[PDB]
Amino acid sequence: WNGFGGFAKNGQEYVVRLNGGQSTPHPWINVISNENFGFHISAEGAGFSWSRNSRDYQLTPWTNDPVINRPGEAFYVADVETGKLYTPCAALSRDPEAMFETRHGLGYSILTGVADTLEVELTQTVDREKPVKFSQVIVRNKGSKSRRLKVYAYVEWVLGNNGQKSAPFILSRHDAGSNAIFASNPYSIDYSARTSFLTLDSEASGFTTSRREFIGRFGSAQAPQGIVAGAALSGTTEVDGDPCAALMQEIHLKPGEERHMTFILGDADNAEEAEALVKDVRQADFLSVLEESKKFWTGFTGQLQVSTPDAGFNHMVNNWLPYQALACRILARTAFYQSSGAFGFRDQLQDTLAFPDLARTQILRAAGRQFPEGDVQHWWLPLTGAGVRTTISDDVVWLAYAINQYVSATGDAAILDESIPFLKGPALMPGQHDAFFQPETSERSATLYEHAALALDLAIHRTGENGLPLILGGDWNDGMNRVGVGGKGTSVWLGWFLAGALRDFIEIAEKRGDTDRVGKWASHREKLRHVLETAGWDGSYYRRGYFDDGTPLGSASSEECQIDSLGQSWSVLSGEGEEGRSRQAMDAVMEHLVDEKTGIIRLFTPPFSRASHDPGYIKGYPPGVRENGGQYTHAATWVVLALAKQGRAQEAWNCFKLLNPVNHALDAASSETYRVEPYVVTADVYGEGAYAGRGGWSWYTGSAGWLYRAAVEGILGITRTDGKLHVSPSLPEDWSGFSIRITLDGKARDIAVSRKAGTADVSVSVDG
Amino acid sequence: NDDMDMDIAREALSAHEYLRSRGVIFDLVIVNERAASYAQDMQHALDHISETQRRINPADGRPHVFSVRRDLMDEETWSALLAASRVVLHVRNGK
């Protein structure tokens, strides 16, 4: 219960209440998407439509302005006789005597506005398979006299990458036999055959495709001017400097009945295809798809259910974390802050790690992008596939991690034998770090074995004189670039990760059978681990790496980046290393964790203030934000996983409660510094300077899935080792017991865990 | 499309260079709508005056001067170029 909004029980609905004029510190958006469509709606008015991919394709202007956030879609139900307008959105009505209530659910939103006895309910949802979005407007009158109202639907058509470029070259047409408005952008680089439609399920009284006539000068979203300066909305057909779409319907409602209306917005290729789509949708029903989406989200999120005593924990885990993962790092790789629609290689590898067939699809898609030289495409487009081939090192071995994890989880060797063609291109030139070009398919087929072998051989060839893997151009943290570039930039995290991968690759090679390569892997593992225990220790913690000048990184002798946490976590996360050295590393990690007053988990204790070895553009970051010594949930998730795995469960959950956005500083109004939605996990949290305790770049984060895995395997203790679910419980001192409800292959189990052990169906020991 | 004017071209390129000096950057494209009877002569005449402006700009690729002829390049591309222009001016019909 906060001053703005909270939950609606069961962790499936978030209800935010506001008056007329107030607003959240940041847009409290909810993202709803499908395989080939998506949008997200704030708590007071927003909307961001895209047909194929974001950034390159978009429908409404994407103004990531936290302070203003001018809405792109508006709906007015203004009065005819009196003149006072009304709007379900909270950011449009300036009347102080108004009540707005926004409910964000699993794949839908409902905004209810009450102002002077008049009720307006706007329900936004999306259709599966067919890319299109539905908006139901319900007008309810509870007064004593009949009222005449006009319902409006305003949205500005911008298409392509950025606005104010394609604006003078957007064609708008109005269908006569159908109540639809069509917008096209022939002046586009690639998407020129795509047309967008705004349609009404009834006869629209008027249309106006022009911002000059709808809003015009001396006006804004709250004061459209044209809404009150008369009502003769002229039908605009000529192409002007500002494209939009406005529909006007006259309604006369008597007290006692509710008026229902449906608006349709979509985009599809081909004019006749769009015509067929709008024709089908016009007589298509609105509710049935809504219950279909609700049932889909309930079933997908209902596979795993918990009954822990923690109220906040019972909401993020049940629905919100999987929903965010699916809507951000699976379907729609775009939020209000970051819009990266390209399929990141490592992103697509690590997104599917908490589940079944989705991981198989992602891994085969990733294998489909690979060069015979050994390296892989960093990212590509879903349709064209034209991406980049950079010098990032860990990308190739991330596929190795994904494949070995999939083998460990499922155990199906058939996926290991699949046909995957190679590619070809201009390779690389030793004067740059990346190239765009366009990859072309070839006729050299192989399976995952050859791809893994090529990636591993590339990693072996790209090794330093000290034995540790080179950084070349960079690593996972792209901010720490310009450390290699023809030099000797080594790392310990990469060595840990490669050792962890080979620890099971030796087994899979022995099962398959190859001695000339397993001998090489054994020798490499011995050499690498000898380097790690010899040239990998600072005295109390693991280092980070070495610069081109030989200066160690992650040591106390440097003025910046003195203590790290990634290598310390991955020391036990990979599995190798000594127990005492691991415990000392955890004790050192506790240094940057004691900062409970701010409530973050810093990555590097000394922020990169000045430049001494040019570790990249991290020095460009303000000291204390993002990776510049700030907080990063992805980094801390591995830390809490390591804490749970080693045995320290109480400390693991104590740190986890700090990581959980719920019950984190901002509870009701106690910490306005957080400024970001508490029902989703964020990626950047600031803990230095005047903005200490402020989050940033939520939703679109690669930490939701990792946090879900940490909860499932570390806190809950359930895991999928080989077919049968293994239970390794370690409860805190404030839960006593709980119950896990899981389904698999149509079989449902309700395992009740007490303080020591037990099961509801029958008594059995752990790992049963 | 006249070949008698042969004076609005210098004024147009003077406007282009004046605006490029003022700060705004835009591309000046000249289109030869005449057939092959005098297309080469018109091309030579316009080159003789645009060669002093199409030279490479020190420290800023090719400068914002373009010359095309309707006789060679395709009619559909010609229509696309005319549509893509925010403003169209005719040598005969105005000044």
Question: In the 3-class helix/strand/coil scheme, how is A531-570 assigned residue by residue?
Answer: HHHHCCECCCCECCEECCCCCEECCCCCCCCCCCCHHHHH
The pair of three-digit structure tokens given for residue A48, joined into one six-digit string: 């961001």
Residues of B in contact with A168 (CB under 8 A): 86
Residues of B in contact with A187 (CB under 8 A): 83-84
Q: Give which of A215, A276, A275 is closest to A246, Cα–Cα.
A: A215
Residues 6+ apart with CB under 8 A from A132: A37, A126, A264, A265, A266, A277, A281
A185 to chain B, minimum CA–CA distance in Å? 12
Q: Where are the alpha helices (DSSP H) in A253-386?
A: 271-283, 287-301, 313-315, 321-328, 345-351, 357-367
Residues of B with CB under 8 A from a CB of A: 83-84, 86
Residues of B in contact with A170 (CB under 8 A): none
d(CA B95, CA A347): 59
A566-574 and A493-512 helices cross at what angle (nearest 10)? 20
**CA A593: distance to chain centroid?**
26
Resolution value (Å, 1 decimal): 3.8
Interface membership of A240 toward B (CB under 8 Å) = no
Interface membership of A241 toward B (CB under 8 Å) = no
d(CA A395, CA A389): 11
SS3 call for A692: coil
By the 8 A CB rule, do A206 and A233 touch? yes
A437 to chain B, minimum CA–CA distance in Å? 19
Residues of A in contact with B84 (CB under 8 A): 169, 187
A391 to chain B, minimum CA–CA distance in Å? 28
Would you mind telling me the total number of residues written for chain A in this entry? Answer: 768
Q: List the single residue in A with minimal CA-CA distance to B80.
A: A187
Q: List the single residue in B with minimal CA-CA distance to A171.
A: B83
Contact A187 B84 (CB under 8 A): yes
A239 to chain B, minimum CA–CA distance in Å? 12
B80 to chain A, minimum CA–CA distance in Å? 9
Residues of B in contact with A169 (CB under 8 A): 83-84
Residues of A in contact with B86 (CB under 8 A): 168
By the 8 A CB rule, do A739 and A751 touch? yes
Residues of A in contact with B83 (CB under 8 A): 169, 187
Tokens 């203790």 locate to A717
A204 membership: H or E segment, kind and range:
none
Ramachandran assignment for A539, one of left (phi > 0), alpha (psi -120 to 50 degrees), beta (any other) = left
d(CA A256, CA A146): 9
Q: List the single residue in B with minimal CA-CA distance to A169.
A: B84
Residues of B in contact with A240 (CB under 8 A): none
Q: List the single residue in B with minimal CA-CA distance to A167.
A: B86
Q: From residue A691, how far is each of A29, A463, A658, A665, A694 by CA, in Å?
A: 22, 41, 18, 14, 6
Residue-wise over A692-708: b if at least 16 C-beta within 10 A, else e?
A: bbbbbbbbbbbbbbbbb
SS3 call for A18: strand
By the 8 A CB rule, do A333 and A700 touch? yes
DSSP-derived pairing of the beta strands A423-424 and A440-441: antiparallel
d(CA A427, CA A22): 55
Q: From residue A300, how far is each of A47, A106, A232, A305, A319 by CA, in Å?
A: 25, 11, 49, 11, 9
Strand blocks (E) in A429-517: 440-441, 490-491
By the 8 A CB rule, do A764 and A752 touch? no
B85 to chain A, minimum CA–CA distance in Å? 10
A168 to chain B, minimum CA–CA distance in Å? 8
Amino acid at residue number A211: R
Neighbours of A382 (CB within 10 A): 12
B47 membership: H or E segment, kind and range:
helix B39-50
Q: Give which of A560, A652, A574 is closest to A606, Cα–Cα.
A: A560
By the 8 A CB rule, do A2 and A92 touch? no
Interface membership of A171 toward B (CB under 8 Å) = no
| Contacts across the A-B interface (CB distance below 8 Å) | 5
Q: List the single residue in B with minimal CA-CA distance to A168.
A: B86
Q: List the single residue in B with minimal CA-CA distance to A187.
A: B84
d(CA A494, CA A464): 12
Tokens 């007290």 locate to A255
Q: List the single residue in B with minimal CA-CA distance to A170.
A: B84
By the 8 A CB rule, do A714 and A641 touch? yes
B24 to chain A, minimum CA–CA distance in Å? 16
B34 to chain A, minimum CA–CA distance in Å? 27
Cα-based torsion angle of the residue sequence A393, A397, A399, A404 in order, rounded to the nearest 10 degrees: -170
Amino acid at residue number A546: Y
Q: List the single residue in B with minimal CA-CA distance to A240.
A: B86
Residue-wise over A637-658: b if at least 16 C-beta within 10 A, else e?
A: bbbbbbbbbbebbebbbebbbb
Interface membership of A735 toward B (CB under 8 Å) = no
Residue-wise over A282-312: b if at least 16 C-beta within 10 A, else e?
A: bebebeebbeebbeebeeebeebbbebebeb
Contact A187 B86 (CB under 8 A): no
Give all strands of the β-sheet with A108-115 in edge-to-edge order: A5-7, A14-18, A99-104, A108-115, A118-126, A132-141, A258-269, A194-200, A180-184, A171-174
Q: DSSP secondary-structure letter at A38?
A: E
Amino acid at residue number B79: S
